[PDB]
Structure 1
């Protein structure tokens, strides 16, 4: 076998076609970005 696949078809492993190693795979990071403002009638400071 060459590929790899979790439940929901999603390649989660592969095997070098030039050394034959099982190399797992994991998506690059991502997520939201929220901004906490005290109020523009009070300050222009913010936290993220």
Structure 2
């Protein structure tokens, strides 16, 4: 599973049988626990 983003320490608690974690919009949020937060972007 490839992607671009920022790895962050996660305060959420996973389960032994859970590897990935997706929030709303069915997009990758956490990967085994490390949270994926895309780097800052916007308009100019």
Q: TM-score, normalised by structure 2?
A: 0.55
Aligned residues: 27
Structure with higher Rg: it is 1
Structure 1 residue runs without a partner (length 5+): 16-21, 34-48
| Aligned residues: CA RMSD | 0.7
Q: Normalized per residue, which structure has more strand? A: 2
Higher RCO (C-alpha 8 Å, min separation 6): 2
**Which stretches of structure 1, 4 residues or more, deviate above 4 A after TM superposition?**
none
TM-score (norm: length of structure 1): 0.51
Structure 2's unaligned 5+ residue stretches are 1-17
